[PDB]
């Protein structure tokens, strides 16, 4: 028999299946002998200690900055003072160097939140002795000369001596649950074009500059022995906290500066000498 | 990878860690590495094909610093913004990858003329763009698709885009992501180990095309390298929130 | 772990690592990088014949060349670097018994350990970082800063305290084996004898007091913790 098929349905024709997503379903056609075969990971597989998310990368300790601390630095003097924003390093100049892994991964996202961790490693010995106070300051910032204003915030006085390292969690205290990134979401300028106000006027977003600072001031002036160095260097590391969070994938803030060469056809393009 | 918690010997009191803000705005969590690399990246933006050549070669490698534009050098058919994608920045940290990729081709046509796609397995060379293979002046008799390699076909009128999933055909455990120099003439068997093959795209007549790429479902990166030395100038091309 | 009061022989609470027929003591504590796995399972496929180990030869501590840290070295300066196993064969400690199996066999898989011993005085101060980069061939001039060094597997050496570091290096290569020796009759298509790179960098410059010493020294030691060799051949001189 040849009976008529009466069953039907209304379909909405789309070109691609789940084009913009990073999960779910897909209409992909495997270029294999077997249509449902996959790459075996029986022997060769991802090692357990490799970062599975970007939040694992943002928990790697990177060296942010350095500064000096001499015997000549009178009490209350700002040794270190930066705007602690993971979005951008500077607002007023071109940056070049080695950005920390938590800053590198942050630059991929439009929003961040949660605490940030610091770690101050004093490149010293047993015979160095001083005291610094590390303060986190929100919304309103202190004057350079008024140390008292810095003391009336969230502080951790570190007594340097035998121990040469102090950890400091910066508590996340802002008006919004997530801050937005100060770096632009999309920037088509690639040829270092000379910028004007008409260019600025037609930007992608408005840079909401962070006023949150972390200052390090002298409490007890560094009094080393005669036989050792009068000035030490301090290394300031930085990673995202245990509750660090990112959202909204954008065009990356940072890009490779050193040793970038575009690919060519090998060996058509005069590889044979 | 190394956390660096090794060096965290401090055991003194600290401020609270609070509560995670994950899943607060929406459940859609975008933090996973295997979700970012599974997002499609654009490669060739309205590049031209020819029937006069063997076809258009697309070397099967993930998008990274290899496919980056530097200012004031030779012009390529690759789009300039491959360098600065989130999907590239991830591949700049991992030097090994393994598993299938997913190329998406979009022909700018609605004709009955069929376009073909051909996965050539890892054969050692790393060519891209249009090529006259063996310098012949006629390929219509002996086409690259007709030789008898795995081959799908687009028919623009029915649907002017396909999504293929090219297998990890190689003798290596891992395909290498990047080099310190792409244009350097070093030992020839090692230069080949940064691709796992090629896509070729032959048309009947001349036509334009766009190519995207991403990681397949079966895809793992490894051999973490940390972040590179970088430059930025985003500050410069935007107004402050204070005029 | 805990120091005691001073006896005739000072603060006698030293530990020691005894590996085969070589012992290395240590005064202060030891920093150790995480013990992480290597590629396994391909071994039985890639080599049809059985693979051999020579623990007595290869698992003994071998000192290589001394490193000279000065007060003139800036941050991100390479103090030394080692392409391995190439440099342990033909560049440093050329007549070591650790190299004997590399003469005869053509392939292998190598998990290493590297102990560093520094001796700067108590009136000095400085930080040196040592880090491994797995499969670095034609990737030495990128991701090669102190910043990338802190991300990859690494140890950290304070030059005042004189702590010791031990960097464990798994075999993480794009191929199954690494070729040991280049030869006139062998292929030039592949780069042999380099599966990794070890960088020793100044994280913070050395500093000294008035009329102090303007330098101090570090000494690396290596040992293979799992050296498997495959493909026996006629014995040749190393490079």
């Amino acid at each position: 028999d040849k009976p008529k098929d009466v069953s039907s349905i209304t379909i909405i024709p789309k070109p691609r299946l789940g084009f913009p997503h990073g999960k779910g379903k897909s209409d992909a056609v495997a270029m294999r002998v077997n249509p449902v075969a996959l790459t075996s990971f029986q022997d060769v597989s991802a090692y357990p200690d490799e970062p599975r998310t970007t939040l694992d990368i943002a928990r790697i300790w990177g060296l942010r900055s350095t500064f000096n601390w001499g015997s000549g630095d009178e009490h209350g003097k700002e040794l270190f003072n930066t705007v602690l924003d993971p979005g951008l390093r500077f607002y007023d100049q071109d940056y070049e160097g080695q950005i920390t892994p938590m800053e590198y991964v942050t630059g991929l996202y439009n929003f961040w939140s949660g605490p940030i961790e610091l770690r101050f490693d004093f490149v010293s010995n047993a015979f160095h002795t001083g005291t610094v106070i590390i303060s986190a300051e929100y919304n309103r910032s202190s004057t350079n000369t008024d140390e008292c204003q810095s003391h009336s915030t969230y502080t951790k006085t570190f007594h340097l001596g035998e121990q040469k390292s102090v950890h400091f969690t910066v508590p996340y205290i802002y008006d919004t649950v997530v801050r937005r990134n100060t770096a632009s979401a999309y920037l088509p300028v690639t040829d270092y074009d000379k910028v004007d106000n008409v260019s600025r006027a037609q930007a992608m977003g408005i840079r909401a500059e962070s006023k949150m600072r972390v200052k390090v001031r002298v409490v007890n002036v560094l009094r080393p022995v005669a036989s050792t160095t009068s000035t030490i260097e301090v290394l300031v590391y930085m990673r995202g906290g245990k509750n660090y969070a990112l959202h909204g994938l954008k065009q990356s803030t940072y890009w490779p500066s050193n040793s970038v060469v575009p690919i060519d056809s090998f060996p058509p393009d005069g590889y044979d000498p | 990878m190394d956390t660096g918690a090794k060096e965290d010997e401090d055991e003194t009191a600290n401020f609270s860690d609070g509560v995670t803000a994950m899943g607060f705005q929406s459940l859609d969590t975008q933090v996973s590495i295997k979700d970012i690399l599974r997002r499609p990246v654009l490669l060739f933006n309205h590049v031209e094909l020819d029937p006069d050549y063997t076809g258009f070669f697309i070397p099967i490698m993930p998008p990274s610093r290899m496919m980056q534009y530097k200012s004031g050098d030779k012009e390529t058919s690759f789009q300039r913004l491959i360098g600065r994608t989130p999907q590239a920045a991830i591949m700049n940290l991992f030097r090994f990858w393994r598993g299938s990729l997913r190329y998406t081709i979009i022909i700018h046509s609605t004709d009955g003329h069929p376009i073909y796609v051909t996965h050539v397995p890892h054969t050692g060379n790393r060519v891209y763009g249009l090529m006259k293979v063996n310098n012949l002046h006629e390929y219509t008799k002996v086409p690259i698709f007709g030789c008898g390699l795995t081959t799908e076909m687009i028919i623009p009128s029915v649907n002017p885009s396909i999504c293929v999933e090219v297998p990890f055909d190689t003798e290596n455990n891992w395909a290498v992501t990047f080099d310190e120099d792409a244009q350097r003439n070093y030992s020839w068997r090692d230069k080949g180990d940064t691709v796992t093959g090629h896509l070729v795209v032959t048309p009947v007549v001349s036509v334009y095309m766009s190519v995207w790429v991403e990681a397949g479902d079966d895809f793992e990166v490894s051999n973490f390298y940390g972040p590179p030395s970088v430059k930025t100038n985003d500050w410069n091309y935007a107004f402050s929130d204070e005029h | 772990e805990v120091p005691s009061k001073e006896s005739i022989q000072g603060d006698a609470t030293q530990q020691s690592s005894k590996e085969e027929n070589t012992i290395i003591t240590r005064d202060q504590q030891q920093t150790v990088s995480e013990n992480i796995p290597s590629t396994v399972g391909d071994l039985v496929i890639a080599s049809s014949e059985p693979t051999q180990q020579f623990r007595s030869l290869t698992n003994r501590w071998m000192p290589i060349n001394s490193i000279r840290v000065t007060v003139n070295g800036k941050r991100n300066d390479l103090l030394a670097q080692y392409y391995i196993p190439e440099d342990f064969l033909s560049t440093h400690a050329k007549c070591a018994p650790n190299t004997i199996p590399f003469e005869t066999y053509v392939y292998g898989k190598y998990e290493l350990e590297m102990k560093f011993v520094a001796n700067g005085n108590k009136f000095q101060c400085g930080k040196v970082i040592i880090s491994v980069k797995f499969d670095s061939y034609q990737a030495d001039n990128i991701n090669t800063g102190f910043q990338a060094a802190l991300s990859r597997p690494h140890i950290m050496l304070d030059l005042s305290t004189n702590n010791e570091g031990v960097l464990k290096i798994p075999f993480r290569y794009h191929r199954a084996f690494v070729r040991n020796q280049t030869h006139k009759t062998a292929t030039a298509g592949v780069r042999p004898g380099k599966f990794a790179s070890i960088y020793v960098q100044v994280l913070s410059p050395l500093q000294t007091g008035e009329g102090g010493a303007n330098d101090m020294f570090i000494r690396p030691f290596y040992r293979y913790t799992r050296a498997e060799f495959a493909g026996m051949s006629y014995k040749v001189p190393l490079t």
């Binding site: - | 120099d181 | 670097q81 392409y83």
Partner: peptide
């Protein structure tokens, strides 16, 4: 010609990459 093709002799080894002896490359 293209300068990237071959590295200068003084900085490089036989295999046409930066020598391990040459520390100044950074």
């Amino acid at each position: 010609d293209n300068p990237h093709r071959f590295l200068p002799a003084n900085v490089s080894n036989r295999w046409n990459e930066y020598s391990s002896a040459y520390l100044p490359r950074v």
